[PDB]
Amino acid sequence: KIGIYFAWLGYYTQMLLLAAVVGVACFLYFGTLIFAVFMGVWVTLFLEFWKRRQAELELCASAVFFWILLIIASVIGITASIISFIIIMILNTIYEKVAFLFQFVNYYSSCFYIAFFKGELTTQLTIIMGGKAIWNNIQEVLLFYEYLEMIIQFGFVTLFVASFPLAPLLALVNNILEIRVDAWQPIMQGIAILAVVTNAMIIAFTSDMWHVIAAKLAFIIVMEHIIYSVK
Amino acid sequence: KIGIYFAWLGYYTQMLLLAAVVGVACFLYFGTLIFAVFMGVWVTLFLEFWKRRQAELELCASAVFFWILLIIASVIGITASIISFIIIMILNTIYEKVAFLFQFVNYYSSCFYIAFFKGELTTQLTIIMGGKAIWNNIQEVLLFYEYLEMIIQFGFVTLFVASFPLAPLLALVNNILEIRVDAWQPIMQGIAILAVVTNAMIIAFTSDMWHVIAAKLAFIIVMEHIIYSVK
């Protein structure tokens, strides 16, 4: 119950740290796209090795979706990431009182809204990840939700891998201090398939890594096909 | 063993007949593309309902792949479908003596070779399906391999759905006579995901249903995304 979930946070923290070492190596280093296709292979290898350690270790709803759309509309509204983190914090508390997919919607909606909005993410992804890290550290000093925070970080690392490549280490290091606070797959694989599409769209739409729309679509097709071939 | 496989040929024959009735209705009827997107939904619904009835019911290798490439090269070499069926019959016997994926390679390679070669299929798919049906009927008069033949027919119906839409009924009817001869999923789901890509490429490259390469790629992307949304 609590303990296997605790070591499950540990195993996801360890695999996120080891994939973070591989990601930090590619971050020291077309190199961003090398990191991106590497991150596609890394999401595939992460799902594989996490499966291996997993084996070894053991009408109001339509109103809700409309309020979620309005949440994205409010979400469209460096200091800007601080104000966005402030309102996202308050909206996260209100949404948690309202009831997860909502919290991922509130956090990731601004970033996906930017990536659609040109149709920033380096700074907003870094400040949202770092600010959730520093706010979690302030909570660790001052005091499932933890795996929610780390899964939001995995969405940060996996979905926005094309932005800043050193972002993987910055997750797990913070996460290990969460073990200190204790001391005092399906949504993830969905985020991974969406991360294959999202990192392909991050290279294709966001990155700048009548041909170009067609080649962006073709790279989405070929990278999805090759990264589906590997997995 | 033999019996549950026999009723499994029966259940695939029945579901192929019911999806064949739906396909015959769309065949009586942009209508080909309506049939194609319907066939994408039908492949998804076929996998779903087949899963439901499934629940209710119960270095020489590199030389081989090189010989398979040479088999495709020989494969590139209305009467033409008859000669192709003749050589494919002899090559099928030689390949079966040589050892399935090989037989699907030999049969489907000419059709996929055409669809790449412009980069026919109505007539070649109809004559290959009908000729395998008539040759199977001659075998039924004169006398796993059966599920191999029907899976080749499912590749015919599902992979080449954009060509001729009445092709679904023409499978199962012939298959039911195979029960008379008795009386006297993973490869399939792979063929289905390849059929989503293949029917999208059949509409996009083959059909004719600098924008057009981009919109063909976009229809492959959107139809793969929507047909993956449904499934």
Phi/psi region, residue B208 (left: phi>0; alpha: psi -120 to 50; beta: rest), is: left
Residues B75 and A49: their CA atoms lie apart, in Å, by 41
Domain-embedded: residue B22: yes
Per the CB < 8 Å rule, is A221 touching B217? yes
Where residue B189 falls (left for φ over 0; alpha for ψ -120 to 50; beta otherwise) is: alpha
Q: What is the distance between the alpha carbons of residues A106 and B77, in angstroms, rounded to a whole number?
A: 58
Centre a 10 Å sphere on the Cβ of residue B100 and count the other Cβ atoms it contains.
13
Beta carbons within 10 angstroms of residue A211's beta carbon = 10
- Does residue A124 lie within any of the structural domains? yes
Please report the DSSP string for chain B in residue order.
-HHHHHHHHHHHHHHHHHHHHHHHHHHH--HHHHHHHHHHHHHHHHHHHHHHHHHHH--HHHHHHHHHHHHHHHHH--HHHHHHHHHHHHHHHHHHHH--HHHHHHHHHHHHHHHHH---HHHHHHHHHHHHHHHHHHHHHH--HHHHHHHHHHHHHHHTTTT-TTHHHHHHHHHHHHHHHHH--HHHHHHHHHHHHHHHHIIIIII---HHHHHHHHHHHHHHHHHHHH-
Residues 6+ apart with CB under 8 A from A79: none
CA-wise closest residue to B195 among B230, B160, B149, B147: B160
Q: How is residue A92 written in tokens?
A: 């996260």
Domain of A24? Answer: 2-58+120-230
Burial class (CB in 10 A: 0-12, 13-18, 19+), A57: exposed
> In whole angstroms, how far apart are CA B133 and each of A125, B128, B164, B181?
59, 8, 16, 13
CA–CA gap between residue A117 and residue B181 (Å, rounded)? 63
A70-85 burial, b if ≥16 CB within 10 A, otherwise e? ebbeebeeeeebeebb
What SS3 state is found at A219?
Answer: helix
Position B211 in a domain: yes
CA A63 to chain CA mean position, Å: 27
Q: How far is B186 from chain A (nearest CA, A)?
A: 15
Q: Are B195 and B38 in contact (CB under 8 A)?
A: no
One-letter identity of residue B193: I
Contact B128, B81 (CB under 8 A): yes
Give the integer Cα–Cα distance in Å for B87 and B217. Answer: 35
- Looking at this protein, which amino acid is placed at residue B30? F
Count up the domains in chain B and report the number.
Answer: 1
Determine, yes or no, domain membership for B97: no
Q: Could you tell me if residue B33 is inside a domain?
A: yes
Cβ–Cβ under 8 Å, residues B35 and B23: yes
**B169-to-B123, B129, B198 alpha-carbon distances in Å:** 16, 11, 20
Q: How many CB atoms lie within 10 A of CB A148?
A: 15
Half-sphere exposure of B19 (CA within 13 A, CB side): 28
Binding residues of B for Ca(2+), by number, are 140, 146, 149
**Exposed, middle or buried: residue B210 (CB in 10 Å: 0-12, 13-18, 19+)?**
exposed
CB-based contact B157:B26 (threshold 8 Å): no
Indicate the DSSP class of residue A144. Answer: -
DSSP H or E run through A139: helix A121-142
B210:A213 CB<8 A: no
Query: Is A178 a domain residue?
Result: yes
Q: If residue A92 lies in a helix (H) or strand (E), which one and from where to where?
A: helix A79-98
As a whole number of angstroms, the distance between CA A123 and CA A79 comes to: 10
Task: Supply B145's token pair.
Answer: 């391999």
The angle, 0 to 180 degrees and rounded to 10, between the axes of the packed helices A79-98 and A60-76 is 170
Q: Is residue A153 part of a domain?
A: yes
| CB-based contact B55:B78 (threshold 8 Å) | no
C-alpha dist (Å) from residue B19 to B70, B171, B178, B223:
36, 11, 19, 20
Q: CA A69, CA A78: separation in Å to the nearest integer? A: 25
In this structure, the number of other CB atoms found within 10 A of the CB of residue B227 comes to 21
B119-150: buried (b, 16+ CB within 10 Å) or exposed (e) per residue? eebeebbbbbbbbbbeebeeebeeeeebbebb
Write out the two tokens for B98: 């040589």
How far out from the chain centre does Cα B87 lie?
19
* Of the candidates A164, A231, A160, A171, the residue with the CA atom closest to the CA atom of residue A201: A160
Give the minimum alpha-carbon distance from A37 to chain B in angstroms, rounded to a whole number: 19
Give the closest-approach CA distance of A218 to chain B in angstroms: 7
CB contact under 8 A, A210 and B210: yes
Which of chain A's residues have a Cβ under 8 Å away from the Cβ of B220?
221
Contacts of B211 in chain A (CB under 8 A): 210
Q: Tokens 């509204």 appear where?
A: A77
Domain-located, residue A35:
yes
Residues annotated in a binding site of B: 140, 146, 149
Total residue count of chain B as it appears in this document: 231
User: Any idea which residue has 């302030």 for tokens?
Assistant: A138
Torsion sign, CA atoms B18, B105, B111, A230:
positive
